[PDB]
Structure formats: C-alpha cells, structure tokens
Amino acid sequence: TTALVCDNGSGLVKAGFAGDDAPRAVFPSIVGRPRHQGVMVGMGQKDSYVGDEAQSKRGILTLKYPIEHGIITNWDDMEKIWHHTFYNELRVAPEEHPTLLTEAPLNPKANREKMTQIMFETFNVPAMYVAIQAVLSLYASGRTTGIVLDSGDGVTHNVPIYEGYALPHAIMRLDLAGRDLTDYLMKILTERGYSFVTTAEREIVRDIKEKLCYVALDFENEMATAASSSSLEKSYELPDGQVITIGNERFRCPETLFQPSFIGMESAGIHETTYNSIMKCDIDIRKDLYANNVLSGGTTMYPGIADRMQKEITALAPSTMKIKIIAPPERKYSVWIGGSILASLSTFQQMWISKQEYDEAGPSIVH
Amino acid sequence: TTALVCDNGSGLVKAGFAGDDAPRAVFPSIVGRPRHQGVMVGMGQKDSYVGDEAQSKRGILTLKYPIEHGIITNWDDMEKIWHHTFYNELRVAPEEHPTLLTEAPLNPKANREKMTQIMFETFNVPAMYVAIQAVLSLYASGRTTGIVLDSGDGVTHNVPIYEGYALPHAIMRLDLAGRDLTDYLMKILTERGYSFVTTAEREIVRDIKEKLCYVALDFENEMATAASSSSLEKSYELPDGQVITIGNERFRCPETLFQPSFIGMESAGIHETTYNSIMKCDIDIRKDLYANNVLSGGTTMYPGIADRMQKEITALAPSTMKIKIIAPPERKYSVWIGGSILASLSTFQQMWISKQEYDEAGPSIVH
Amino acid sequence: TTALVCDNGSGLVKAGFAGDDAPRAVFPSIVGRPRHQGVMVGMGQKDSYVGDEAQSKRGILTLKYPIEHGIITNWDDMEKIWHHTFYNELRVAPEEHPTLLTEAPLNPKANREKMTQIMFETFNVPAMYVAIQAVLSLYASGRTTGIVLDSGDGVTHNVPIYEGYALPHAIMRLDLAGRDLTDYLMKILTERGYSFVTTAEREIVRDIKEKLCYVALDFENEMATAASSSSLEKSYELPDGQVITIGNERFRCPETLFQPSFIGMESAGIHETTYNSIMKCDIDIRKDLYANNVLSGGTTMYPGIADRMQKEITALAPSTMKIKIIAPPERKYSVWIGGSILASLSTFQQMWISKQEYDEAGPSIVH
Amino acid sequence: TTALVCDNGSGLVKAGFAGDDAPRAVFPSIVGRPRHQGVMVGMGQKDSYVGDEAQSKRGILTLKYPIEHGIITNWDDMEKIWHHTFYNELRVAPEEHPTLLTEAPLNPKANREKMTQIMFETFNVPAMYVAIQAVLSLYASGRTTGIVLDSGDGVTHNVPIYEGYALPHAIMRLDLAGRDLTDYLMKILTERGYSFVTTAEREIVRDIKEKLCYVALDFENEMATAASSSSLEKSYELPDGQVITIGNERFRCPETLFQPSFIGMESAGIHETTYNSIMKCDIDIRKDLYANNVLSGGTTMYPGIADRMQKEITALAPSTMKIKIIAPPERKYSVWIGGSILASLSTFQQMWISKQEYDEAGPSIVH
Amino acid sequence: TTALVCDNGSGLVKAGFAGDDAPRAVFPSIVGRPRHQGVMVGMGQKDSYVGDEAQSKRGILTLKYPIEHGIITNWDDMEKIWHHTFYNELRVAPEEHPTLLTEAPLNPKANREKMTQIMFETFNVPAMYVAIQAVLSLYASGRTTGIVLDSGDGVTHNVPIYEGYALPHAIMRLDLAGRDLTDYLMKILTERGYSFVTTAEREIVRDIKEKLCYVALDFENEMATAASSSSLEKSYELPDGQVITIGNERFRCPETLFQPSFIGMESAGIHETTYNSIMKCDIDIRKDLYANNVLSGGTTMYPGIADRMQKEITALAPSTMKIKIIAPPERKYSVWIGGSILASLSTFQQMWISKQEYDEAGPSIVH
Ligand SMILES: Nc1ncnc2c1ncn2[C@@H]1O[C@H](COP(=O)(O)OP(=O)(O)O)[C@@H](O)[C@H]1O
Ligand SMILES: Nc1ncnc2c1ncn2[C@@H]1O[C@H](COP(=O)(O)OP(=O)(O)O)[C@@H](O)[C@H]1O
Ligand SMILES: Nc1ncnc2c1ncn2[C@@H]1O[C@H](COP(=O)(O)OP(=O)(O)O)[C@@H](O)[C@H]1O
Ligand SMILES: Nc1ncnc2c1ncn2[C@@H]1O[C@H](COP(=O)(O)OP(=O)(O)O)[C@@H](O)[C@H]1O
Ligand SMILES: Nc1ncnc2c1ncn2[C@@H]1O[C@H](COP(=O)(O)OP(=O)(O)O)[C@@H](O)[C@H]1O
Ligand SMILES: [Mg+2]
Ligand SMILES: [Mg+2]
Ligand SMILES: [Mg+2]
Ligand SMILES: [Mg+2]
Ligand SMILES: [Mg+2]
Incomplete structure (x- = not known):
C-alpha cells in the first residue's frame, strides 16, 4: 500500500511512491491557457493545458503558476495539476495510498486546511500528512x-x-527564490537589448539562469574579469535560433540572494x-x-x-x-528522500491523519 | 445532402461537391459584354456572357473581372457567375445543399455580409459558412x-x-498576384514591340505567363545567361499565328513577387x-x-x-x-481539398450558419 | 403578303419575292435614250427605254447607268427602273408587300434617306428595310x-x-469592280486595234469579259505561255460578225483586282x-x-x-x-438568298420600318 | 558648339539649335515616291522625295510615314529624312554638335538602340541623348x-x-492621335459622299481637321444645334476648287479622344x-x-x-x-523649349552619351 | 550659455533652449528616401530628406523612423535628424551649449553610450546629460x-x-504606444475597405487617430450607441479628396491600451x-x-x-x-518643461557630464 509523496513547490511538482530513490513525475506546476482564441476547428480544444503539455505549447498559452511564495493562489488550478499528477503520470487511484504532502514553514493556515479538505473530499485518501519541508531535507x-x-x-x-x-x-x-531571480534576470537582461516580456519567455530565461548563471566568490572580482570580457560572456541559443551573449549578468543575477537590495528589499x-x-x-x-x-x-x-x-x-x-x-x-532528489524515509519508518505510521478522522478532526488538528 | 464547396477567387471559380478530390467546374470569373453593337439579327443576342462562353468569344467581348483583390467590386456580375455556376455546371438547386464559401483574410466586412445575404435570399440555401482561405489549404x-x-x-x-x-x-x-504580374508582364513585354492593350489580350499574356515564365534562383545569373540568348528566349505562338520571342521577360515578370519595387510598391x-x-x-x-x-x-x-x-x-x-x-x-486542387474535409468532418456540421438563422443572426454573427 | 427583295446594284437589278430560290427579274440597270433624233413617224416614240428593251436597242440608244459605285447619281432614272421593275416584270403593286432594299456599306447618307423617301411616297409601301449587302451574303x-x-x-x-x-x-x-475592269479592258483591248468608244460597245466588252477573261494563278506564267500563243488567244465573235482575237488581254484585265496600279490607283x-x-x-x-x-x-x-x-x-x-x-x-443567286431568309425569319419582322412610321422616323432612324 | 534638338514625332519633324525659341525646320515626316512611272525624260528623276518637296507633289507621289505610333517602321526612310534635315534645312554637319533626340515613353527597345547606332555610325555625332517626351514638355x-x-x-x-x-x-x-483621328474623319466624312481614298487626300483631310474641327463641351448639345444647321456646317475649299460642307462631322471627329468606342477600341x-x-x-x-x-x-x-x-x-x-x-x-513650340533648356543646363552636359562611349556602352546603357 | 534640451522620442523631436516655455523645433523623427529613382535631371537630388521636408514629400519617399520603442535602430539616420535639428531649426553650434538628452527607462545600455559618444565626438558639446523621461514630466x-x-x-x-x-x-x-495603435488602426480600418499599406499612408492614419479617436468610458456602451450609428460615425477627409467614414473604429483603436489582447500581447x-x-x-x-x-x-x-x-x-x-x-x-509641452527647470536649477549644474570628462569617464559613468 506503500505510500505517495507529493512535493508541491512553486515551479515543480516532485511526486512518486515512497521508499523509492527519485520522484518519477517531475513536471512544472503550470496551467497554460490559450491566449489567442484559436478560430479553428478541431484544435484541442484543450481549454486547459497542465504541466509538460502546457510547456510544449508555450507560444500559444498563457502560463500561470498556481502557487506563489508557497501560498496557494488559485485553488482549482492546483486541483488541476493534482488530478493530472495522480491519473496521467502516477496512474494511481489515491484511495489505495496514504499521501504525504509538503509545505513551507510559517505558511498561512489556509494552505493546510484547504489542502487536506481537497485531498480528502475531491480525491479520496485513506490518510494523509503535511510536513515542513526543511525537516524532510534533514x-x-x-x-x-x-x-x-x-x-x-x-x-x-x-x-x-x-x-x-x-x-x-x-x-x-x-x-x-528562483522566481524572483528570474524576474530580476529579466530586467537586468534587458539592458543588453534582449526584451522578454511574456510568461512563455520568462521560462526561457529560467532556462538561461539554470545553465549559465553562477555565484561569484567575489562579485567585484567577477566584475573586473568581466570588463575585459574573456570567459564571463557566454553564448546561449534560444529555441528561435537567435544568439544571446550575457557577461556580468551571468553572475549578478544570483548575487541577489546575498544582496536583496538589487530587488529593492530590506531583508x-x-x-x-x-x-x-x-x-x-x-x-x-x-x-x-x-x-x-x-x-x-x-x-x-x-x-x-x-x-x-x-x-x-x-x-x-x-x-x-x-x-x-x-x-x-x-x-532536488534529496528533499524527496527525507520524506520517503519517514513514510518508510515504522514509527511515523501512527501520525497519519485519517480521512475519516480528518473531517472530525478539523483544520486545527492538522496544524 | 453532402455539401457544396465554392472557392470564389479572382480569376477562377473552383466549385464542386464536398468529399470529392477535385472541383468539377473550374472556369474563369469573367462577365464578357459585347464591345461592338452587333448590328445583326439573330446573333445571341446574349447580352451577357459568363465564364467559358465569354472566354471563347474574347475578340467580341469586353471581359470584366467581378472581384478585384478579393474585394467584390460589382455585385450582380458576381451573382451572374454564381447563378451560372449552380445551374449550368453543377446542375444543382442550392436548396438541397449547404454551401461553404471562401474569402481572403483581413477582407472588408462588406464581402461576408453581402455574400451571405445573396446566398440566402436570391439563392435559397439551408445553411452556409464562409472560411478563411489559408486554413483550408492547411x-x-x-x-x-x-x-x-x-x-x-x-x-x-x-x-x-x-x-x-x-x-x-x-x-x-x-x-x-497573377493579375498584377500579368499587367507588369504587359508593359515589360511591350519593350519588345508586342503591344497588348485590350482585356482579351490580357488573358493571352496570362497564358504566356502560365506556360513560359519561371522564377530564377538568381535573377542576375538569369540575366547573364540571357545576354547571350541560348535557352532564355523561347518561342510562343498566339491564337492569331504570330510568333512572340521572350527572353529575360520570362523570368523578370515573377521576380516582382520578390522585388515589388518593379511595380512601384514599397511592400x-x-x-x-x-x-x-x-x-x-x-x-x-x-x-x-x-x-x-x-x-x-x-x-x-x-x-x-x-x-x-x-x-x-x-x-x-x-x-x-x-x-x-x-x-x-x-x-489549386489542394486548397479545395482542405475545405471539403471540413465539410466531411463530424464536428464542423455544428458551425453551419442556417439561412433561417442568418437573417436573425445578422452580418456580425457570421464574422 | 410574303415580301419583296430588290437587290439594287450597279449593272444588274435582282428582284423577286422573298422565300424563293432565285430572283425572277434580273435585268441590267440602264436607261437608254435615243441618240439620233429619229426623224420618222410612229417609231416608239419611247422617249425612254429601260432594262432589257434598252439592251435590245443598243445601237440607237445612249445607255446610262443610274447608279455609280453604289452612289445613286440620277434619281428619276432610278425611279424609272424601279417603276419598270414593279409593274412590268414583278407585276405587283408595292402596297401589298413590304420591301427589303439593298445597299453597299459605308455609303453616303443620301442613298438611304432619298431611297426610303421614294419607296414610301412615290410608290406606297407598308414597310421597308435597307440592309448591308455583305450580311445578306453571309x-x-x-x-x-x-x-x-x-x-x-x-x-x-x-x-x-x-x-x-x-x-x-x-x-x-x-x-x-466590273465597270472599272470593263473600261480597263477597253483601253487594253485597243492595243490590238479594236476600238470600242461608245456605251453600247462597252456592254459588248462586258460580254467578252464575262466569257473569256480569267484570273491567272501566276500572271507571269500566263504571259510566258502567251508569248507562244497556244491556248491563251481565243476567238470571240461580236454581234456584227467580225472576229476578235484576245491573248494576254484575257487574263491581264482581271489582274487589276490584285494590281490596282494598272488603273493608276494606290489602293x-x-x-x-x-x-x-x-x-x-x-x-x-x-x-x-x-x-x-x-x-x-x-x-x-x-x-x-x-x-x-x-x-x-x-x-x-x-x-x-x-x-x-x-x-x-x-x-449572284446566293446574295439574294441571304436577304430572303431574313424576310422569312420570325424575328426580323419587328425591324421593318413602317411607311407611316418612316415619315415620323425621318432619315436618321433608318440609318 | 551649342547643340541640336531633333523632335522626331510621327507627322512632323521639329528640329533646330538648342537655346533658341522655336524649331527652325518644321516639316512633315514623309518620303514620297512617284506612283506613276513617269514615262518622260528629264523629270526628276528624284526617285525619292522627302518632306516639303514630297508635300508639294502629292498628286504624283505615294506618301509614306516612316514612323507609326512612335515605332520606327522603315529604317532607311527615317535615315532619309534625317539626312535631309541635317544638310538641306539645318545646313549643319552633325560632327560639330551633340544631338538630343526624342521618343515616346514605353517604346520598344528597338527604337533607342537602332536610333543611336544610326546617329553614331551613319552620321557622326560626338555625343547624343534620347529623352522621354513628356519630361521635356514639363x-x-x-x-x-x-x-x-x-x-x-x-x-x-x-x-x-x-x-x-x-x-x-x-x-x-x-x-x-491625329493619324487615327484623320482616318476616322475619313470614313465619317464619306457619309456625306466625299470620298478620299488616297494618301495624298489623307493629308487634305488632315488639313480640314486642323482648321475646322473642334471639341464640343457637350457633343449632344452640338448635335442638337446641328440638326438645325446654323453655325455647325462650315464651307471648306479643297485645292481642286470643290466645296465641302461639314456639319456634325466637325466636332464628332475629335470626340474620338473621349469616346474611343467610335474607332472600335476598348481603351x-x-x-x-x-x-x-x-x-x-x-x-x-x-x-x-x-x-x-x-x-x-x-x-x-x-x-x-x-x-x-x-x-x-x-x-x-x-x-x-x-x-x-x-x-x-x-x-508644339513648347515641347521643343523644354528639351532646349536641358541642353542649356550646366548640369545635363554630364549625361550626354559620347559616340565613342556609345559603341562600348551598347544599347542597354542608353536605356 | 543657457542650455539645449532635446527630447528624442519616437515620432517627434522636441528640441529648444532651456528656461523657455515650449520647444521651438517640433518635427517628426523621420528620414525619407525617394522610393522611385527619379529619372529626371535637377530634381533634388536630395538623396535624404529629414523631418518636415520628408513629410511634405510623403508620396515620393519611403519614410523610416530611426528609433523604435525607444531603442535606436539606425545610428546615422539618428545622426541625420540631430544635425538637421542643430543647424536648420535651432541654428546653433552645439559647442556653446551643454545638451540635456532624453531617453526611456529600462533602455539598453547601447543607447546611452553610443548617444553620448556621438554628441561628444561628431558634434562637439562641452557637457551633456541623459535623463529618464518620467522624472522630467514630474x-x-x-x-x-x-x-x-x-x-x-x-x-x-x-x-x-x-x-x-x-x-x-x-x-x-x-x-x-501611438505606433502600435496606428498599426492596429490600420488593420481594423481595412475591414471598412480602406486599404492603407504604405508608410506614407501610415502617417495619414496617424492623423486620423490624433483627431477622431477617443477612449470610451465603457466600450460596450460605445458599441451599443454605434450599432445605430448616430454620433459615432464621423467623416474624415484625406489629402486626396476621398471621404472616410469611421464608426466604432474611432474608439476601439485606443481601447488597445486597456485591452492589449487586441494586438495579441499578454501584457x-x-x-x-x-x-x-x-x-x-x-x-x-x-x-x-x-x-x-x-x-x-x-x-x-x-x-x-x-x-x-x-x-x-x-x-x-x-x-x-x-x-x-x-x-x-x-x-507634450509639459515633459519638456520639467527638463528645462532642471537645467535652470542651481544644483544640477554639477551633474553635467563634461565632454572631456566623458571620454575618460566611459559609458558606465553616464549610466
Ligand atoms: N541548475 C540550476 N541552477 C540554478 N537554478 C536552478 C537550477 N535548477 C532549478 N533552478 C531554480 O530552482 C527552481 C526549482 O527549485 P525546486 O527545489 O524545484 O523548488 P520547489 O521545490 O519549491 O519547486 C526553479 O524554478 C529554477 O528557477
Ligand atoms: N501554371 C501557372 N504558372 C504561373 N502562374 C499561374 C499558373 N496557373 C495560374 N497562374 C496564375 O494564378 C492565377 C490562378 O490562381 P488561383 O489559385 O486560381 O487564384 P484564386 O484561387 O484566387 O482564383 C491565374 O490568374 C494565373 O495568373
Ligand atoms: N461570268 C462572269 N465573269 C466575270 N465577270 C462577270 C461575270 N458575270 C458578271 N460579271 C461582272 O459582274 C457584274 C455583275 O455583278 P453583280 O453581282 O450583279 O453586281 P451588283 O450586284 O453590284 O449589280 C457585271 O457588271 C459584270 O461586269
Ligand atoms: N491646329 C490643329 N488642330 C487640330 N489638330 C492638329 C492641329 N495641328 C496639328 N494637328 C494634329 O496634330 C499632329 C501634329 O502634332 P505634333 O505635336 O506635331 O505630333 P508629333 O510631335 O508626334 O509629330 C498632326 O498630325 C495633326 O493631325
Ligand atoms: N491629439 C492626439 N490624440 C491622440 N494621439 C496623439 C495625439 N497627438 C499625438 N498622438 C500620438 O502620440 C505620439 C506623439 O507622442 P509624443 O509624446 O510626442 O511621443 P514621444 O515623446 O515619444 O515622441 C504620436 O505618434 C501620435 O501617434
Ligand atoms: Mg522546495
Ligand atoms: Mg485562392
Ligand atoms: Mg452586289
Ligand atoms: Mg510629340
Ligand atoms: Mg516621450
């Protein structure tokens, strides 16, 4: 009956069975919606795309992250990617498996109670648990x-x-986080003239950030090496075919984690x-x-x-x-492993919140 | 009840039943009118010739394209070729068949509303649809x-x-398009001395363009081979019996599609x-x-x-x-096939605009 | 009521009823007038001879064609042969029959208006029409x-x-035409010594032209065969009894149609x-x-x-x-037949110009 | 060295020196040839007459326009009137003067290349230019x-x-143009009975057209005034002595420019x-x-x-x-003036096509 | 020495002296180039037209905005309109005046460094400054x-x-912006049949947009009033003389600012x-x-x-x-005033970037 571990972060859903080594379904948490009312017959219609399918058709769709800063913003888009996760990648009726969910610490009480009420009522789960991310990584x-x-x-x-x-x-x-860094890489990238305005292009720059960007030991040293552009400018190729050349932008994007004053935050x-x-x-x-x-x-x-x-x-x-x-x-695999071990443990099986128990238990018990 | 597909382009009407492979009636969209008031008794009188009959008698008639750049210029000449298309080539009362019509994209709203109002009121059609050409070719x-x-x-x-x-x-x-290229071939042909002034002769040059003309891989290369006229000058024979010899004019006519500056257009x-x-x-x-x-x-x-x-x-x-x-x-056959498949499709039959529905629906619904 | 068809050409009047196969009265258009004032009692007097009677008495009369090159030169001589045509060969009051008249194309407006005004006022015709010759032959x-x-x-x-x-x-x-060719045959014939000066003799040479003359395939070839006069010289006998022998003159008379430079015309x-x-x-x-x-x-x-x-x-x-x-x-019969068919046709009877209508209509309507 | 301006239109050669006010030699472009082989001794012989001399002897000669619709039809007749223009009216060796020639727009490439090759090789011109007529008139x-x-x-x-x-x-x-209008005035004039068949008479009617004919403000109004012939019929006198009287023909000849349907052209x-x-x-x-x-x-x-x-x-x-x-x-003077100013201009002297340069340059450079 | 304020936006150059109330030279930022190779002598030649002169001759020229979306696309066309601005409207050597330039925020670093390097090296400016537009408007x-x-x-x-x-x-x-709205007004206007394809006509529609167009309080309300076309259809007159009648197009053009989905943008x-x-x-x-x-x-x-x-x-x-x-x-005047006050201020004169200083300072200091 083993168990289901669903890591619902912004940007990526990492889901799979417990006791395994890596999540099997790893796909972005997006619900694409056609931007141009396809005035054709037969197309889709696919009123809503989700995950990888939405990714493939970025140029048509408006991409919409359902979860912003850990907070669930839109609750049926979340439902959409959950249903898609359970029947089209995991292929698994949730009624056979207890489900361990994930969430960030210090998160509004609206995410644990609405999340369990959906898992329990829309899907039918025998029992479930919501765990704080950092403990699973430990x-x-x-x-x-x-x-x-x-x-x-x-x-x-x-x-x-x-x-x-x-x-x-x-x-x-x-x-x-990566979403704040990809937006900052947006407006810093545009000083070279490369304009990425749309949500589909945002995920392109997310790709540029994942490959090229790096955190300087000393950013000033990186700037000095950059002035005479030897190794700091690298050529990245879009899916269109054009050539982007990014020098100091490669490293000054992640410098935002150590100098939040670049985004205008006092933290x-x-x-x-x-x-x-x-x-x-x-x-x-x-x-x-x-x-x-x-x-x-x-x-x-x-x-x-x-x-x-x-x-x-x-x-x-x-x-x-x-x-x-x-x-x-x-x-990324490591965070999932810590949660899976806990499901594996012969001492955590008492802490599951039964679906039948949950309705009587209410939101407060889960928290 | 199958369906009628009428491709109403300038120059050619391609009409026939849906689900077939090729249009059956393919005739030019012209309404010839006698130029010289035949001072004879019995001749015709045939106050108006249309399509192939008008073509046969080019020397007598003034040929008049009813549709210029997709825009319908004269509305009873259009009616003329439609009536002729339905009763003398297709042999078919429009009351038994829904009719799929064609039109160019980005076309004045006067063509879809006047077109449906004629199809509906002068002819009687159970239902009809007007489709954008390029989607049918796809x-x-x-x-x-x-x-x-x-x-x-x-x-x-x-x-x-x-x-x-x-x-x-x-x-x-x-x-x-072919009409602009045949006119440019007119004034470029006249530098050899061959003067074609009349509308009947315009369709002769349209014939010369269809057979001889070709698009150079490199026009400059074609010009070089032409200076020493080996294969670039070809002999075409008119219906009169005279011999036209066209060299570089063969290829520099279609070069206008890639260099509209030959007609004096900035596009x-x-x-x-x-x-x-x-x-x-x-x-x-x-x-x-x-x-x-x-x-x-x-x-x-x-x-x-x-x-x-x-x-x-x-x-x-x-x-x-x-x-x-x-x-x-x-x-030419391919464009028709795409429209026929859509009529064939078991999902497009909902999108027909009923004749009874159309009067209530008005011009705006069709668009 | 059937109809009257009168072909009024120079040289011959071909008249008869419509729907028939050949004109019944075919006689030359001449008004002979005694040249020598017959100082006898009882002779004629027949101040004016017309047609066949004038022909019989050529030696006494001055023959006078009333119509020269299609143009009516003398208007009461024309009237004379018309009256003679209607009462002494056709035997027919023009009041019972509509009359189709003939004329050459591109002919002065004085022939159609004076012609109809005579047909209408001197003779009384219910209705009439004037037709262009070549269309009737077609x-x-x-x-x-x-x-x-x-x-x-x-x-x-x-x-x-x-x-x-x-x-x-x-x-x-x-x-x-035959009149120009018979005059050229006059002065070409006189190089053999045969002098025909008078109008009566002109119609003799017209007879010689009708029988003997022929159009060479190649006139130069005919000239060569003529130099050694084997078949090119033929013997014609006048009414007097003398023997004319004409060789190359037989063919070089009609050569004038193809070489008008023999009469001194640039055409x-x-x-x-x-x-x-x-x-x-x-x-x-x-x-x-x-x-x-x-x-x-x-x-x-x-x-x-x-x-x-x-x-x-x-x-x-x-x-x-x-x-x-x-x-x-x-x-000669063929031209008449085309006019007769038009009178026969059940669609030309609307185009008659009524005599009563004509006076109101005026000259211009007829043209 | 000033310059020579030769306006070679059909019907009239207007030639003279540049910088002047009016062309000095203005004579018709005709090459008369004796029609009747003058069987006399001493006459001429003058195998070819050109211009004014040919005009004086119209009754003897066949007049032949060397240039039809701007297109050069006969190339040694053109040479004839050029040689005559340079040595018997302008009195000027072309070797001292650069020569500005004229031609109609949209004219076969055979007129500019054969024209320059003659100017250059038969006559010897230091440099020459061929200009489009309408720009000179401007x-x-x-x-x-x-x-x-x-x-x-x-x-x-x-x-x-x-x-x-x-x-x-x-x-x-x-x-x-005037040649088409004088021919139409030919066959319209012949409805009054006045037959002008020959080329010599064509130039008589050209004279009638120049004096009497006028373009109605409204032709229908002119027709109405003509029916009661008060001022619309005028008496013109031929060189023979006969009196022509032309009424509505005076104005309906030039109406052809605004109603080309009278000549049977669709334009x-x-x-x-x-x-x-x-x-x-x-x-x-x-x-x-x-x-x-x-x-x-x-x-x-x-x-x-x-x-x-x-x-x-x-x-x-x-x-x-x-x-x-x-x-x-x-x-007529104005067109010449525009060309003369260009020769006068201190900026057009670079655009001359040198005779030595022309042979190397070829036909294409001139065009 | 007062100062020069040049507002270089797309579409309009607003330039003039500091401390004044309105810019004195306000002319469009275009470099017209003759489209048809004027085959005449003397014309211009004026290989390049700029600003108002180019505007006057729209029918001859290809109009070319040198600055697209704030980004400088063509750098010598920009130079052209600057040189024209300094010597033919302001009449002023830039060496006597420090120059305040303008630019949009978040603009590629290629515009401030190439702009100063031109101002400094091609023109000679004692000192200059580049300011963000919105601060000047404030x-x-x-x-x-x-x-x-x-x-x-x-x-x-x-x-x-x-x-x-x-x-x-x-x-x-x-x-x-106005350029995107005038293009959308292009293809929306063409549903009435009015085809404006060329760049010269684009500025005509820019004129129509400036006068007639208006932003609805509620566009749906405007549509309702438009269906029964009472005040929403207005008559505009082109320079040619034709009459355009635009109804709902008047208001639905600027609706694009609030519904960018009409141009197909997600923003x-x-x-x-x-x-x-x-x-x-x-x-x-x-x-x-x-x-x-x-x-x-x-x-x-x-x-x-x-x-x-x-x-x-x-x-x-x-x-x-x-x-x-x-x-x-x-x-439009207001934006200029804010910049002029800053030049006026007795505290901004320290922030000028000296031309001598700039070469040592480099691109980075200016930014
Ligand atoms: N190789 C990489 N280098 C830098 N940043 C990355 C890389 N891979 C992913 N990221 C960033 O991290 C995010 C994925 O992190 P993840 O641990 O999946 O977050 P969560 O668990 O909250 O979904 C992406 O949005 C991306 O912006
Ligand atoms: N074999 C050919 N080669 C070149 N041009 C052709 C040929 N056949 C037709 N054309 C041109 O294309 C036109 C026909 O194209 P078509 O697709 O029928 O246009 P439409 O569908 O708008 O009527 C004709 O007017 C002719 O000028
Ligand atoms: N058998 C013939 N061969 C040659 N010429 C003839 C012959 N018969 C008649 N002609 C010529 O043709 C003329 C008759 O032609 P016709 O058709 O009657 O002319 P129209 O119809 O104008 O009177 C006569 O004047 C004569 O000169
Ligand atoms: N006064 C006139 N009124 C009407 N037509 C005239 C007059 N003068 C000349 N024409 C016509 O114009 C022609 C002369 O025009 P012109 O400008 O010399 O032509 P081109 O320059 O081609 O030789 C003549 O053939 C004549 O038919
Ligand atoms: N009266 C008006 N109504 C609507 N739009 C206008 C009007 N005047 C100008 N525009 C639009 O605004 C633009 C001019 O704005 P402007 O402030 O000069 O821009 P920039 O400062 O970037 O040159 C023009 O291109 C035009 O399309
Ligand atoms: Mg995480
Ligand atoms: Mg088509
Ligand atoms: Mg006859
Ligand atoms: Mg001329
Ligand atoms: Mg601005």
Missing part, C-alpha cells in the same frame, strides 16, 4: 542536527534543528539570515548548527554558492570555530 | 501547424497557424513578409513555422519558386535552424 | 462568322463578321485589303476570319479567282494557320 | 510637378511627375486615362497632379479641349479639390 | 511625489516616485500596470501614488483617457481611498 541528509537552508522557486527558509527537536522561534522565511542576504537564525538559538547548540548547516532546493544549485556561503558566514561568525557547509549533489 | 496539407503563403490572382496572404489555433495579429496580406517581397510574419509570432513557435511553411494558389505554380524561397528565407533567418518548405503538386 | 452561305468579299459592278467590300456581331471599324470599301489589291481587314480585327477572332472568308458578286465569277486568293492571302498571313476560302457556285 | 512649362498629357500624331501619353522624380508604374500610353477616353494615371499614384501627391496637369502636342490644339477635360476630370475626381488644367498657347 | 507637474504614466510613440512607462527618490524595482515598461492594460506598479511599492507610500498619478506624452491625449483610468484604477484599488488623476493640458 532526513535526506541522514542526520538529526543542523540548520537547513531550503531555497526553492517560491520561498527560502532557515530551519534550525537540534537533536531531533525544533526551534520555532528561530525559523526565518524570506521571499527570495538581509541569505548569509545574514542563516547567521541571524543561529543567533536566536540558545548559546549551547550554535556550534553544531554552524558545523552542520544543510542546503536544499533548486535555487541552491547555482555553482559557487557553497563557497560564497562559507566565506560570508565565516566572516560574520567568530573565527575560532569551524563552519562546515554540507551541500550534497542531488539536492 | 487542411489540404493534412497538417495542423505551419505558415501558409496563399498567392492567388487577387491577393497573397501569410497566415501563421500553430497547433490548431491562429495568430490574427501576424496575418499579413499583400496585393501582389517587401513575399520572402520578407513570410519572414516578418514569423517575427511577429511568439518566440516559442517560430521553429515550427520555419519548418512547416506551406504554399497554395495559382501564383505559387511558377517553376523555381520554392527553391528561391528557401534561399531567401534561409538568408534572413538564423542559419542554425532548418527551413523546410512544403509545396505539393496539385496546389 | 446568310446565304448559311453561316454566322466569316469575312465577306463582295465585288459587284460598282463596289468591292470587305465586311468582317464574328458570331453575329459586326466590326464597323474594319469594314473596307474599294471602288474596283492595295483585294488580297491586301482582305488581309488588312483581318488585321484591324481583334487578335482573338482572326483565325476564324482567315478560315471562313466568303465571296459574292458578279466580279467574283472570273475562273481562277479563289485559287489566286488562296495563294496570295496564304503568302501574307502566317503560314501556321489554315486559310480556307469558300466560294460557292450561284454567287 | 521643362517647357517651367515647372517640376504635374501630369503631362502629350497627344501627337502617333501616340498619346500620360506621364505623372512629382517634384522632379517620376512614376514609371503610372505612365500610360494610348494609340489615339478609356483620355480623361479616364489621365484620371486612372492619377489613381495609380500615391495618395499624397494626387492633389498636385490634379491641379497641375499639362498639355502638349498637335492633337491638343483642337479648340474646346481644355474645357471638356475640366468638365470630365472634375466629374470623375472628388469635387472637393481644384482641378486646374494648364494648356498654354504654342504647345 | 518636474513639469511641479511636484515631487507621484506615479508617472508616460505613453509616447514608442513606449509607455510607469515610474513611481516618492518624495524625491525613486523605486527602480517598480518601474514598468510596456511597448504599447495587462495600462491600468493594471499602473496598479501593479503601485503594488510593488512599499505599503506606506501607496496612498500618495494613488492620489498623485501623473500623465504625459502624445498617447495620453485621446479624449476620455483620464476618466477611464479613474474608473478602472478605482475598481482595482480598495474603494476606501481617493484616486485622483492629474492630467494637465499641454502634456
């Missing part, structure tokens, strides 16, 4: 202590975790928020959090991130203690 | 995506079409308008339009057109992507 | 298309006629005027005129004319097309 | 913008001209061709062409032409804008 | 806070501005982009931006725009707060 590391920085498409979190337990007062969320960079999170923790356990800080999420995949983190957190923290940062390959 | 190709270049006698169109839908903002019409050639049409399309779908661009119409029949298109569109488009041009034999 | 051929060459005694015409209608701008008249021969008439016609219909050119009139009766026409028109026209010349026996 | 008006209607003996043109430049696609040629009248020429022009410049339309040529000399043009073009053009027609006295 | 309002919507011919901007400072992350550019209308711009701003200052939103540019001149903005922004924003829109007459 299971995937195979560790019980550490401070997780999970930066996905919607949200970046810091969740300090000591020997099991948690520290809710030190959990720090920050809306800086400290992700190194002062992980540092500030360790500050709020009790003086005893900070040495273990400094040593064990973990990384997860697609927005942790920029080459050079871990090294810049080690330079900057080692500059804010007292130099007498060792700051080891553990950033394993397969991060 | 059905005839047996394809759902591509950019159609339909060059007939009145008008040349570019209609980009992606996966069903359409892109109205990228539809580009251009008044360059770009048909390769910059198909290129410009693909430009206005969203960056995602342009690779499919480059690969799938389709051709239709009598003015696509000049030998050498497809190859010149591939040289010129491959010179404007980024050389990294494949520009395949599909130009099947039987183009 | 009816007699039983055909609707062709180019008629009608050469009578006064005038030679070319009237191109396509499918009914006419081509007035291509009608070409030329004053070369091209009748083969360049039929060729030039087909030139002025629209390029489409010329192949039918080349194939269908018709012949009529007494001056088409010279043996050898049709063959010489075919050699000469085939030498001026492009050799790629077939020039058939149709010259049926019974030409 | 120089004579002293203006840079306007639409020229030049109607000479062979051809009528419309050449729209805006601010300098030209509009080749709007140039409209039409074979209606629109000269007011619909000047109107149609302004149509083909870009919407911006049409108001200047309507206001500035110019007139030139001998066939513009009929009294009443300008007023009829203003009534008819003002009836076809939107009545909201002013149609001024400028038709200055001295038209 | 100076012209005489205010320090507000959100500027500047819609010109190339680009529409929203620039929120609080108490001096700026908010770069909230600046929102959108390529919808929200200008009321959702000004609303979305205020969203991105910090919660504190939004009440002042709602109250103070300013308007500038030629595309803000459609009658009815401000009222429609107030209905639509008041429908998106919480109804508890006052949305005052300030749209003063003289907008």
